[PDB]
Design a protein around this ligand. Structure first.
Ligand SMILES: CCCCCCCCCCCCCCCC(=O)O
Ligand SMILES: CCCCCCCCCCCCCCCC(=O)O
Ligand SMILES: *C(=O)CCCCCCCCCCCCC
Ligand SMILES: *C(=O)CCCCCCCCCCCCC
Ligand SMILES: *C(=O)CCCCCCCCCCCCC
Ligand SMILES: *C(=O)CCCCCCCCCCCCC
Ligand SMILES: *C(=O)CCCCCCCCCCCCC
Lengths: 68, 235, 288, 235, 68, 288, 235, 235, 68, 68, 68
């Protein structure tokens, strides 16, 4: 029950028949029934900051006057 | 047993590791999440929020509400600066304790564009034009409008839209800058000048404050997690 | 599931082709080095050759293989003394660099610029120093990476060793040498082995002291420090320890070849010292 | 747990090993490469570049610019040598500090063909023919043109093409030679002689220099990585 | 997510029903998400030395006069 | 994914076939050893035989199996003394060879030439020597391969132990014996167990001293040295240690069989010593 | 990490093990084989080659060339033995230092058929018939032709085919015999007798030698590798 | 290396484990089996063979051939027992050294049916009827035929079929019994009585012996391997 | 990239639904790029001894006179 | 002979291309012939408590009078 | 080259979606070329005891007289 995922490669070795290029993957297998035992996957999501940067009721159009 | 051979690293505890480990409370009945408002997914979301700059850290104003107020007045035009600040967002004392600065002090490197927004808090009857400037490093830091005007700048006309934003575009030799004062990765100079002068009619306060805010743009990032010097525990 | 694997480093070099006598206007042997080019000759250009199927390869002199070794870059000393000592418990602080030793430094300096992931391996040894019979229990060491800007420890036991964000290795004496990897962490697109410049422009309108800086230095290479301590409390018999740090540059690329260092190193720049400038020995022009 | 059994080698640190190890800076935002000119993929590329030979290591010329200059003159024909050098590219003092020699001192074994190119630096009015020779080992080293002429050689006519290359073909009993002085893997003798003589008209310098260069051919390789004796750190 | 590659065999044992001959492969599985954690593959490329040995603007034809 | 597996070493030898009485001109028993051939007879050529299904095999006497064992080729001594000693800390230097001991040497010398990968295993033991009660902490050893041409260490702590390019093993006392493999590294196409020649041709025109060299010696077999040290600093109680080196030739081919060594070895060549030349004991010709 | 559990055997070094181990010289450029004549694939190939037996180990002949010569003469017929030898190929002093014997001393067990070939070295004018015998064990060892003639034997007629082979068929209670003197696995008795007598004409040597050789047949094998007592290193 | 984590049990040597381990004699040429008569696949096969019971362990008969002989005579009918034995096959002294008993002393638990067969060894002219009884436990052990006759029993008529078998059916509260004397898993009582009497004509022996044998049935099993108290090694 | 090969079984356990009979195989996976790191396979070949036992130019027919 | 089963995930990391969401499984392989050697699977069943809470012969209908 | 076999389960955990019921198997992989290195499989055979319990030439029919 292996999970195979890709690595985001930073420094690439001089190689494209083994390392740097042809997508380098890594493998994870969970050994425990409790998910709290799992390592962190770090495959995380981002979001728009608007709930903090623009919490105003009427939409902000930046080219327009904020007050109108 | 399967023949195995231990490699270097065996039995060490690297505090940044990421391994599995046995659960001390197996089959625990975990309470489910509810949808709490305000979830955050990345620390840079907090860096994109405007927070207020303690510009005036004079011996009597520092550590008081007055440190946030930049005082202007209707005095005759001068080419001398209202304020001068270095673009060192994690280490200049005026920027390092803003939300942007305090997050940058948990990282070694920063990169991207920033923006400064100023709010005029004089009366509605007060008018004026100011010049907000960013001079990328390598020359004499601007102390006169003549020099500041040659760099990146916004001329702000005070009026019904109360506030004005100057964007400090990412202009840097290195791909990331250090979050400490460092000449090689120095960022340059922020300054504000009177463009014309503040003018008020009679029966109006002749002195008033502006407040400034800093926040990151959407191209801003940080890296190399590190401890901050902003908290300690003595003994 | 299973992935299975254009001139590669382990390919055989070119065969020698058979070539016979020649008499013509083709002139491979004559050339002009003023152009800046090296004459690309092979033996069949100037002698008669037989056919040879070449099997040798340059596999061991690829950049990766030339550098595929851990090299010692520093020795850090720490101790754990009695609590009754007048002297403070010694913890070590080392500014990370490959320039405190000479062998890896000389190899990297065949090039101007490089990119690599870094593997660090740590060998730890300890000994008693006072001719005493007292004993000590097995030590644990904390190796903390303090990146530029983070608070450097001032005492072996102050708050900085909490390491909430700095990476630390807790190494147990007598186990396999500790080891970690680090990505290419440079603030540039490649590490600079040589920087012909300064970190400050001195301005006319400013004092000379204010515009001064060291030649060839920049935060291009400031990587912070390693701070190391014995975690165990003071013991009645003093034990001293050494941590040897080995650096292997892996997944490496390099650019702009240079003549190698020919006289002894003298500090972290290219400076040389009087009395060390005579690398060549005596040999007469017509003596084999 | 899975039954396992530790083998010999367990817990050792071999400095030439090649294993995985945990990352101390997970999810670091790595700066991408740019296309810097001058990338090198193999050390033998550097060995194929011509570098200049310090031929004259006399007590007064060694460690000065004069060590690179081989002086010739318009003297009457002689069969005596202009220079004599042993084909020991990592250990003869004239070759060991050339770029080829300094790379060979990081390896134990070398193999393949080499080439020597000479540059005439006299005036345009100077003429001459020289004989460049390689004698594979096992006989009296050539000290007279008569003997040198029996081995591999090029007769160089000086003229508008300023330079001349002699290829030292790989001729060896072993499949690789040692990078130290060693009789079993000795390489033989390089020498240069006057074939006719240097001739100049009047009002012309009667003495002048030639410079020599060495580089590897495309069939050249090295192996068994080792430390060099060319650098040290005392205490 | 295994990578299987071939070895370049130097000394061959007296065997062609197990070792020396029928291509000997080896297996690699990456255990970590960070590619800096990976071992070196050593599957590297070579290149022509010309950018250092022949950096001249007009092509060198070795049988011809270099200066013409 | 999964690979699954012409006379092999473990095949059964040939069956005995039944054979009956004979009276004819066929003469298997008569032969002529002058030809240089051995008469290829089997029992059915000279006696009556029954049928036998043969199950025995020569699996354990294949070249690989005859040599599939680690053999001790040297014992290296090192120590770690007090810093107050008049005597220098002992590190060891051993020129790599299988000729310092006799058992593996005799087995390899059944052949003239060989090719193999070499597995080296290292067993390390230590002890106190002064009847003292002082103690020592667990030692780490550095085993450095110094190939011919590389700088041999002159002190236990000089710069050469940086090992930027030489391979080194750092072994921790009390752990599993260290082990590495090396490829076939000979500068020839096979290792020569015997070299009937010299490394120098003496020339008439040269002094005898200048053309002289040892009989049977060549760099065919110069493989450099192992240099070993205790990495730990000096300790008040002296500890002495021994590193035993075991060599197993694996993936082996051999050529040109020889009579085995019958009198005691006497140096690294084939020389013999007076008083050792009588391997056979007394036995009367007509006594069973 | 994957849960594992160390079994017995962990960390031991068994000198007969067969495990993988890291390479100290990665990517080394190995020299390829060439086709050297004389490759050997199994030690029993060497055991199948005839080598000469030191039959006469008397106090004055042992350790000299004379130990290989069995002297015959034209004396009148006798039924008394020319030679007597025990079939203990690794431990009888006459067989243990032959190539077969010296290989058997690296193994504990041997099995299969053997063969003895005798070469007549008298003059061409000498004639004779001899009886070569093998008596499997368990009875009085043959000291007279009458008894030897009852076991396995070949009557050799001397003539133009100079040599004669007697095969010692594998006849044994155990499936393998020990390579030491041992009664339970004893092999029996080899002997040679005059069948008629050596006859020579006048002017001919009346005494002459025969030489004997031993080799394994194609059904011969050995097992359980062990060290030999035939070499030692004192101190 | 692959990240692993040692669990409890690591490095222990459990003498009942079942793991792989390296071979000290690789590629050994093993001698093949031959088909030897008498192979055994399970210890219970041996338990199914009749072996003779040492019934009479009196101070003078124990440890002599007489312990196996149960003496009968032609005396007038009595209801008193010929023999009395407890069904404790591994621990009653009369059963524990039979082949069944000695195998049961290597196990902790036994279960299944047993059978006792008696052989009459008087003369052919002797006749008689005997009653063989098994009384499952929990009541007064039978000392009179009246009580024994109420349990499981066989009335044996002596005659041309010399022998008679009584099966002791597995009747037990627990699913296995202990192989030691234990009340909770006690098995009950075996006894033999005269049913009529032994009768002989004149000129005939009036006293004679019977021999008894015990063996397991095909439903018999044992478990929990253990050491026996039937052998020891003092010092 | 596993190599599966068969064992030559000497002593057989009483089993043919698991051990002794239904061909017992074993598995090898190489962990290293260098083939010198490999274990020995021991799957070796034999040859005819003739280059040592019969190195004569004209073929030996054993039933015939060696000298003719 | 691997057993792959799913985990009941409690705290979910910010991830649905690796952790929290796309069912996280775990793997078990038994290494021993004796089942007593096995770990506990914890995949257990529940039952109705009625044999203890309602052991009455005539069915309890809670909206009805218990005694009727 | 894995051998998968079934366990004879004695105590069953309360589980039939993971342990006790849906046949529990175990896995064996041999790591060595020599079969003497193998663990014992314990998958052994039984036989009829007759060669010891009834070694008589003429077949025993238990309901019949043994002597007739
Ligand atoms: C817990 C261990 C942490 C290890 C931290 C490693 C920090 C980065 C070190 C960068 C090494 C740079 C080598 C090249 C230097 C140069 O530019 O000249
Ligand atoms: C860190 C350990 C390194 C081990 C280095 C091994 C170096 C090569 C040794 C070659 C052994 C040669 C054996 C045969 C010698 C011969 O030709 O007679
Ligand atoms: C998915 O899990 C099936 C593929 C199995 C690959 C090998 C598993 C490696 C060992 C895991 C052991 C069980 C951990 C408790
Ligand atoms: C590809 O990875 C799928 C094949 C899986 C083969 C077995 C994996 C061996 C154990 C790896 C464990 C996970 C490492 C973090
Ligand atoms: C072939 O190799 C693919 C099958 C993979 C089976 C599991 C591999 C077991 C772990 C090997 C790890 C990599 C060794 C460097
Ligand atoms: C099912 O078992 C076949 C899939 C095999 C996956 C890899 C097995 C991992 C190692 C188990 C070793 C044997 C344990 C005694
Ligand atoms: C059959 O063997 C192919 C399936 C391979 C499964 C993984 C093997 C686990 C590791 C075995 C290593 C080799 C042992 C010498």
């Amino acid at each position: 029950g292996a999970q195979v995922s890709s690595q985001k490669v930073g420094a690439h070795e001089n190689s494209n028949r083994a390392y740097g290029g042809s997508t380098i993957n890594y493998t994870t297998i969970n050994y425990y029934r409790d998910s709290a035992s799992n390592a962190a996957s770090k495959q995380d999501f981002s979001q728009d900051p608007s709930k903090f940067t623009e919490p105003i009721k009427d939409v902000l159009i930046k080219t327009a006057p904020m007050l109108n | 047993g399967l023949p195995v051979m231990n490699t270097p690293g065996s039995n060490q505890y690297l505090t940044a590791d990421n391994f599995q480990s046995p659960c001390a409370l197996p089959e625990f009945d975990v309470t489910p999440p509810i949808d709490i408002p305000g979830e955050v997914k990345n620390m840079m979301e907090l860096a994109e929020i405007d927070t207020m700059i303690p510009f005036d850290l004079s011996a009597t104003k520092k550590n008081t509400m007055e440190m946030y107020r930049v005082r202007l007045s209707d005095k005759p035009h001068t080419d001398d600066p209202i304020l001068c600040l270095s673009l060192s967002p994690a280490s200049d004392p005026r920027l390092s304790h803003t939300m942007l600065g305090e997050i940058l002090n948990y990282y070694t490197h920063w990169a991207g564009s920033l923006k400064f927004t100023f709010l005029f808090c004089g009366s509605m009857m007060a008018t004026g034009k100011l010049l907000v400037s960013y001079a990328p490093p390598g020359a004499d830091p601007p102390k006169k409008r003549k020099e500041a005007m040659l760099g990146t700048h916004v001329i702000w006309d005070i009026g019904l839209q109360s506030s004005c934003t100057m964007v400090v575009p990412w202009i840097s030799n290195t791909t990331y800058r250090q979050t400490i004062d460092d000449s090689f990765t120095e960022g340059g100079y922020i300054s504000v000048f009177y463009q014309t002068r503040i003018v008020v009619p009679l029966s109006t306060p002749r002195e008033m404050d502006i407040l400034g805010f800093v926040s990151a743009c959407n191209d801003f990032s940080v890296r190399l997690l590190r401890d901050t010097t902003h908290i300690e525990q003595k003994a | 599931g299973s992935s299975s694997t254009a001139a590669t480093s382990r390919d055989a070099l070119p065969n020698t082709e058979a070539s016979g006598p020649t008499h013509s206007k083709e002139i491979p042997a004559l050339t002009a080095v003023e152009t800046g080019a090296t004459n690309p000759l092979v033996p069949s250009d100037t002698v008669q050759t037989r056919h040879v199927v070449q099997h040798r390869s340059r596999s061991e002199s690829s950049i990766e293989s030339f550098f595929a070794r851990g090299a010692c870059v520093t020795i850090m000393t720490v101790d754990n003394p009695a609590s009754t000592t007048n002297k403070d418990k010694l913890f070590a602080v080392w500014k990370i660099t490959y320039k405190d030793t000479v062998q890896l430094r000389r190899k990297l300096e065949f090039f101007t610029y490089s990119r690599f992931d870094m593997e660090l391996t740590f060998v730890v040894t300890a000994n008693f120093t006072e001719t005493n019979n007292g004993h000590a229990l097995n030590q644990v060491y904390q190796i903390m990476y303090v990146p530029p800007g983070a608070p450097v420890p001032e005492k072996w036991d102050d708050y900085t060793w909490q390491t909430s964000s700095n990476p630390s290795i807790f190494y147990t004496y007598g186990t396999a040498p500790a080891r970690i990897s680090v990505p290419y962490v440079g603030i540039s697109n490649a590490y600079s082995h040589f920087y012909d410049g300064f970190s400050k422009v001195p301005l006319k309108d400013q004092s000379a002291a204010l515009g001064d800086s060291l030649y060839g230095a920049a935060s291009l290479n400031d990587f912070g420090i390693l701070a190391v301590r014995v975690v165990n409390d003071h013991n009645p018999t003093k034990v001293t320890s050494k941590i040897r740090v080995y650096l292997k540059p892996k997944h490496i690329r390099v650019w702009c070849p240079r003549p190698p260092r020919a006289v002894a190193y003298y500090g972290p720049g290219v400076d040389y010292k009087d009395g060390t400038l005579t690398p060549l020995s005596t040999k007469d022009l017509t003596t084999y």
